[PDB]
Amino acid sequence: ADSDVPNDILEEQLYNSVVVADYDSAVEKSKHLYEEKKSEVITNVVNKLIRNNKMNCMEYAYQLWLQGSKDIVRDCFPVEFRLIFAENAIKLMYKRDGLALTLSNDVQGDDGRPAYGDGKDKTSPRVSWKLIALWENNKVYFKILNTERNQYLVLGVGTNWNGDHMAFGVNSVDSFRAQWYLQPAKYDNDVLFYIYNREYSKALTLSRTVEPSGHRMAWGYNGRVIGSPEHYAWGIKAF
């Protein structure tokens, strides 16, 4: 009888449940709350996780999605979380510039197609991406597939003077350089995500330098990103 527990208390223990990464328990309490009509408990927990930039939010959503609770992700989480986990075509839009992430037309080096924010285009099939979930080591990571080119996003192994790594599309996952993790954030009314490389733990960002073409190169950033989602974070929209 969850009716007999204050709502504030129900929020807290689900939230604690997620933050300590106890996912069977969070999924179990969630299935029960939803059942008894208490969905706002869940929605409040989700908003708290997003505001506090809680990485465990992603594991939470993904577990809900795998464990027969697609209904919960759909109802208590912003539409982004359904696009991620249903693996729908998305666009990745960099909050600071409003630029859409894409791969270059021309294959440069073994490196594959340099990635960058497109100075103009937010509509062509070049800008469509898929995020493909995997569970390992009690965490959730994603491969980021560019759908037109069928190439995966990665951080090159070399650095520039500042320790930043270029981002490219390549044909092959051999390594953690092709896998990423997400941290949710709230800006204005947006749900935004910091997007981190699994090998280097650096955030995917767009350079401040505009190319002669109007494009800005995509890098893994050597420096602090958190606390600045309008500079470092990505919004996710349906393609």
Residue numbers in the entry: 1 to 239
How does the study describe this entry?
All Bmlp3 crystals are monoclinic but belong to different space groups, P21 (Bmlp3-p21) and C2 (Bmlp3-c2). The starting model for Bmlp3-p21 was the structure of Bmlp7 and the molecular replacement procedure identified four protein chains in the asymmetric unit. The first important aspect is that each protein molecule traced in the Bmlp3-p21 structure contains all residues of the mature protein; it presents, therefore, the first complete model of a 30-kDa lipoprotein. The electron density was clearly defined for all N-terminal residues, which form a single α-helical turn. The asymmetric unit of Bmlp3-p21 contains four monomeric protein molecules, whereas in the asymmetric unit of Bmlp3-c2 two protein molecules form a dimer. In the Bmlp3-p21 structure, the NTD and CTD fragments are arranged alternately in a head-to-tail fashion, so that residues of the NTD have contacts with residues of the CTD. Although the protein molecules in Bmlp3-p21 are packed more tightly than in Bmlp3-c2 and the solvent content is lower, the results from PISA indicate that in the Bmlp3-p21 structure there are no specific interactions leading to a stable quaternary structure. The crystals of Bmlp3-p21 were obtained with PEG MME 550 as the main precipitant, whereas ammonium sulfate was the precipitant in the Bmlp3-c2 case. pH was also different, 6.5 and 5.5, respectively. In the Bmlp3-p21 structure this cavity is occupied by a fragment of polyethylene glycol (PEG) from the crystallization solution. Through its ether/alcohol character, PEG is a relatively good mimic of a carbohydrate moiety.
The study reports two crystal structures of Bmlp3, a protein belonging to the 30-kDa lipoprotein family found in silkworm hemolymph. Members of the 30-kDa lipoprotein family are the most abundant protein fraction in the hemolymph of silkworm fifth instar larvae. The Bmlp3 molecule consists of a helical N-terminal domain (NTD, residues 1–87) and a β-trefoil C-terminal domain (CTD, residues 88–239). The NTD consists of six helices forming a right-handed superhelix and is classified as a VHS domain.
